[PDB]
Design a protein around this ligand. Structure first.
Ligand code: CKN
Length: 260
C-alpha cells in the first residue's frame, strides 16, 4: 500500500466538504485515479490494513493506501442504494442481480478460504464497480469463539451472532438476508412496514401465508420463476436457525452457479 499524509488527502476532499464531497459514514469523494476516502476505532483501522494486505480478489474492494483509508472509488455505489433506486438510478434487472449475487458469494468464498470471517455482510457493504461487478467492502470488524462486544447490523445478524458467537456460519445467514433483498428489492428492516424484518418473509412462505411470487421485486421485467425460486431456495438454506444446518460458502457458490 501507498502511505499518504493528512493534508495530502485534505484538499482532494475540498477541505472535507460536507455535501460537495461527503458520501456518507465518514466517507468522502477524492482523486489521486478516482478514490473513496474513509476518515475514522484505531484498533479497527489496523485490522482493516491487515485483512486488505492478505486479501486481494476481483470481488473485494481494493485498498489503495492509508494515513484515513483510501479505496478505489466504486462508480455505481452500494447494492443497497441500487436496490432502492436511490438518486434516480434505474432498477437492476434480474440478469444483473444474478451476477451480483454470484460475485458477492465469490468474494465471501475467498475470505472464508483464507480463514477470515467478515462479520458485517449486508447490501450497504456490497459495492458496484463500472461493470456492476460485486465488491465486498468494510473489513474493520473482520476476524481471522465468544465475544463481550456484540457488533454488526441486527437486521442481518444470525441468532448465534446476536448471542456473542463468532463463526463463518453467521456470514452465511447475513448473505441469506442479502439474497432476499435482491429478490424483493426491499430493505432488511423497515419500521413503517409489516413484517418489519425481511428474514421473517421466510416464515410467511413456509406457513403458506404468502408465496415467493407475491414478494418478487415488481421493478424488474426479466425475472423467471425458475431462477427466482432457485435463489430463494439458496436464501432459505442460508437462513436456517441452526448454524450447522446452513450450507458452507462453497455450496452456496455452487448453487448460485447452477442457477444461471
Ligand atoms: C443517503 C445517501 O445519499 N446515500 C448515498 C451514498 N451511500 C453510500 C456512501 C458510501 C459509499 N462508499 C463507497 N463508495 C464507493 N467506493 N467505495 C470504496 C469503499 C467505500 C466505503 C468506504 C465502504 C462502504 N461499504 O461504503 C466506497 C457507498 C454508498 C449511502 C446512502
Amino acid at each position: 500500500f501507498h502511505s499518504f499524509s493528512f493534508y495530502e488527502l485534505k484538499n482532494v476532499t475540498n477541505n472535507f466538504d460536507e455535501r460537495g464531497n461527503k458520501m456518507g459514514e465518514v466517507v468522502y469523494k477524492g482523486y489521486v485515479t478516482t478514490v473513496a476516502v474513509k476518515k475514522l476505532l484505531k484498533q479497527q483501522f489496523d485490522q482493516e490494513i491487515k485483512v486488505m494486505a492478505k486479501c486481494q480478489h476481483e470481488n473485494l474492494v481494493e485498498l489503495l493506501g492509508f494515513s484515513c483509508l483510501v479505496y478505489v472509488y466504486m462508480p455505481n455505489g452500494s447494492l443497497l442504494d441500487r436496490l432502492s433506486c436511490l438518486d434516480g438510478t434505474p432498477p437492476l434487472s434480474w440478469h444483473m442481480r444474478c451476477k451480483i449475487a454470484q460475485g458477492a458469494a465469490n468474494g465471501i468464498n475467498f475470505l472464508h478460504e483464507n480463514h477470515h470471517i467478515h462479520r458485517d455482510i449486508k447490501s450497504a457493504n456490497i459495492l458496484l464497480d463500472e461493470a456492476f461487478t460485486a465488491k465486498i467492502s468494510d473489513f474493520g470488524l473482520a476476524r481471522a469463539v465468544m465475544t463481550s462486544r456484540i457488533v454488526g447490523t441486527t437486521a442481518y445478524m444470525a441468532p448465534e451472532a446476536l448471542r456473542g458467537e463468532i463463526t463463518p456460519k453467521s456470514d452465511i445467514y447475513s448473505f441469506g438476508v442479502v439474497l432476499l433483498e435482491i429478490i424483493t428489492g426491499l430493505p432488511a428492516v423497515d419500521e413503517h412496514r409489516e413484517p418489519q424484518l425481511l428474514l421473517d418473509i421466510k416464515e410467511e412462505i413456509e406457513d403458506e401465508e404468502k408465496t415467493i411470487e407475491d414478494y418478487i421485486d415488481k421493478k424488474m421485467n426479466d425475472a423467471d420463476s425458475t431462477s427466482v425460486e432457485a435463489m430463494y431456495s439458496v436464501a432459505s438454506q442460508c437462513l436456517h436457525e441452526k448454524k450447522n444446518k446452513r450450507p458452507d460458502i462453497k455450496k452456496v457458490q455452487q448453487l448460485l452457479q447452477e442457477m444461471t
